[PDB]
């Protein structure tokens, strides 16, 4: 299967690049605030074409760091804390000749194998190092051993290292940043390319005026439309050089808000009907495409015939089902609008049983529910 053809399944990306300047601002700018009364993760609205990971819908190398990718021209890319590898899968479609070195923490929580890359690309042939036969310690980016064994297959320098790992504290993030630096300055292979080595990593801009480790200079800060509205998540492009400050909550919030108020979510050019069906069946077993009044009423019929392990115990499973159908029915009866938080705020505040929904469905179920919602909204008119 052609990678460039598969690229039409990933949506377009809207973002803001805040280039780090040595010279002071000297502006004294106002603040941009808009309190969206939303309870659902609407950043999954354009991610219906994906199942196990959908990071590729949020961040893209060709979109954000396209010029650096062109200039440096990496033969191999290093993906750490990647999970099911959907951001790595998008990269494989945008750059069809690049090989990959994948690493992800080996635990029961989430994934430690690229299930989505396997799904999108078809085969793991381009993943020259998938971290097979490694310990939990050697797959942890906060440990020295992870960095020591990074070249066990690939002998190419760490020109562009991609990190989408979620850390406990900022101290764990610092552990990784320090270890990256220690490697790129010690390693025989890497030392050859010098200071022109990059680490593009996910960071949550909590505080302000926080100094990066020594000889770690942030080049730019990327604020994604795909990042959760509630937080202060961003992607920082780091390099070796005279250290500077991590992005502050303030700047991130102003940029985060402009994107939420102004821009609309771009839908995918093509529809992966097998992936949509998978998410539909993942949300509610037996859910079929297209989702219409007829399709919804049969799901209402299927639960009626079941009621007419304990007998009282199965009432929990049917309660979840009703909640899902009630929401999808509400989306169906809702007028078509543009994919934006103003319209999403309207959808939620037009629904009477909103709090019952959040109470009855888990975080993963509600994310799945948004993928299905997004498909339905795109399917309209």
Ligand X SMILES: Nc1nc2c(ncn2[C@@H]2O[C@H](CO)[C@@H](O)[C@H]2O)c(=O)[nH]1
Q: Which residues are annotated as a binding site for adenosine?
A: 165, 167, 170, 202, 204
Question: Among all chains, which residue has been given the structure tokens 């399709």?
Answer: 295
Kindly state the tokens that stand for 366. Answer: 């509600």
- Beta-bridge partner residues of 199: 161, 238
Beta carbons within 8 Å of 206's beta carbon, 6+ residues apart: 170, 232, 249
In the complex, least distance from residue 98 CB atom to Zn ion, rounded to whole angstroms: 17
Per the CB < 8 A criterion, the answer to whether 104 and 139 are in contact is yes
Interface with ligand GTP, residue 367, by CB under 6 A: yes
Q: How far is the CB of 349 from its own copies (least distance, A)?
A: 4
Q: If binding is defined by CB under 8 A, does position 350 make contact with its own copies? A: yes
Handedness of CA 205, 55, 282, 41 (dihedral sign): positive
**Which residues, 6+ apart, have CB-to-CB distance to 307 below 8 Å?**
318
CB of 194 to ligand X, least distance (A): 34
11: helix, strand or coil:
coil
Binding partner of residue 189 among its own copies, Zn ion, ligand GTP, none, CB cut-off 5 to 8 Å per kind:
Zn ion
Known binding site for Zn(2+): residues?
151, 183, 187, 190
What Cα–Cα distance (Å) separates residue 132 from each residue in 7, 48, 122? 27, 30, 19
Does position 161 bind ligand X by CB under 6 A? no
Q: Does 364 bind ligand GTP (CB under 6 A)?
A: yes
Q: Are 194 and 232 in contact (CB under 8 A)?
A: no
Selected from 6, 46, 49, 53, the binder of ligand X by CB under 6 A is 53
Q: Which does 48 bind (CB under 5 to 8 A by kind): Zn ion, ligand GTP, its own copies, none?
A: none
Residue 373 touching ligand X (CB under 6 A): no
Could you give the string, one character per residue 9-48, with x where binding to ligand X holds by CB under 6 A and - elsewhere? --------------------------------x-x-----
With b for 16 or more beta-carbon neighbours within 10 A and e for fewer, the 310-322 pattern comes to eeeeeeeeeeebe
368 binds, among ligand GTP, Zn ion, its own copies, none (CB under 5 to 8 A by kind): ligand GTP
SS3 282: helix
Q: Does 368 bind ligand GTP (CB under 6 A)?
A: yes
Residue 35 binding its own copies, by CB under 8 A:
yes
Cβ atoms within 10 Å, residue 137: 13
| 3 state DSSP class of 1 | coil
Which of 3, 226, 247, 374 binds ligand GTP (CB under 6 A)? It is 226
- Of 86 and 154, which has the nearer Cβ to ligand GTP? 86
307 binds its own copies (CB under 8 A): no
Compare residues 43 and 161 and give the one whose CB is closer to ligand GTP.
43
Contact 259, 252 (CB under 8 A): no
Which residue is nearest to ligand GTP, using beta carbons? 228
Closest CA to 86 of 272, 243, 265, 290: 272
Comparison of 18 and 187: residue with beta carbon closer to its own copies:
18
Q: If DSSP codes are grouped into helix, strand and coil, which group holds residue 204?
A: strand
Tell me which of 83, 114, 247, 374 binds ligand X, using CB under 6 A. Answer: 83
- Least separation in angstroms between residue 273's CB and its own copies is 33
Mask: binding to its own copies, 240-259, rule CB under 8 A, as x and -?
------------------x-
Strands 216-224 and 15-19: antiparallel
Calpha distance 189→158 (Å, rounded):
9
CA angle (38 as vertex; 45, 250 as ends), nearest 5:
95
| Position 36 contacts its own copies (CB under 8 A) | yes
Residue nearest to Zn ion as judged by C-beta position: 187
**Cβ atoms within 10 Å of 185's Cβ, excluding its own:** 14
Answer with the entry of ligand GTP, Zn ion, its own copies, none that 294 interacts with (C-beta below 5 to 8 A by kind).
Answer: none
Q: Is residue 274 within the footprint of its own copies (CB under 8 A)? A: no
Residue nearer to ligand X on the CB measure, 228 or 258:
228
Say how far apart CA 80 and CA 260 lie, in whole Å.
Answer: 29
Residues that bind its own copies (CB under 8 A): 27-37, 258, 261-262, 345-346, 349-350
Residues that bind ligand X (CB under 6 A): 41, 43, 52-55, 58, 83, 226-228, 367
């Amino acid at each position: 299967i052609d990678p460039t053809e598969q690229l039409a399944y990933f949506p377009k990306i809207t973002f803001e690049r805040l280039k780090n300047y040595d010279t002071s601002s000297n502006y004294a700018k106002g603040k941009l605030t808009r309190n969206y009364m939303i309870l659902l993760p609407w950043q999954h609205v354009n991610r219906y074409n994906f199942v196990f990971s959908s990071t590729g819908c949020k961040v893209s190398l060709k979109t954000c760091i396209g010029k650096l990718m062109k200039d440096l021209n990496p033969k191999v890319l290093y993906f750490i804390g990647e999970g099911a590898g959907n951001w790595m899968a998008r990269t494989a479609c945008e750059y069809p000749d690049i090989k990959f070195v994948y690493r992800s923490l080996k635990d029961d929580l989430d994934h430690h194998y690229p299930l989505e890359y396997q799904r999108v690309i078809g085969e793991l042939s381009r993943i020259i190092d998938s971290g097979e036969g490694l310990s939990m310690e050697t797959t942890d980016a906060t440990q020295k051993t992870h960095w020591d064994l990074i070249h066990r297959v690939s002998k190419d320098a760490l020109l562009i290292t991609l990190c989408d790992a979620e850390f406990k504290d900022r101290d764990d993030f610092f552990k990784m940043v320090i270890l990256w630096r220690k490697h790129v300055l010690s390693c025989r292979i890497c030392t050859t390319y010098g200071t022109d080595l990059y680490l593009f990593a996910k960071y949550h801009a909590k505080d302000c005026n926080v100094k990066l480790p020594f000889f770690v200079r942030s080049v730019a800060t990327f604020i994604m439309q795909g990042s959760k509205l509630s937080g202060s998540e961003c992607y920082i492009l780091l390099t070796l050089g005279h250290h500077n400050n991590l992005p502050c909550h303030g700047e991130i919030q102003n940029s985060k808000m402009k994107i939420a108020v102004c821009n609309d979510f771009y839908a995918a050019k093509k529809l992966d009907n097998k992936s949509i069906e998978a998410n539909c069946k993942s949300l509610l077993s037996g859910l079929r495409i297209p989702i219409n009044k007829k399709e919804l009423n049969r799901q209402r019929r299927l639960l009626t015939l079941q009621s007419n392990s304990k007998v009282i115990e199965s009432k929990w499973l049917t309660n979840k089902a009703n909640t899902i159908i009630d929401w999808l029915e509400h989306i169906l009866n809702s007028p078509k609008g543009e994919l934006n938080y103003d319209f999403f705020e309207a959808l939620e505040n037009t629904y009477p049983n909103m709090i019952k929904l959040i109470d009855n469905l888990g975080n993963a179920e509600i994310k799945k529910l948004i993928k299905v919602t997004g498909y339905m909204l795109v399917s309209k008119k």
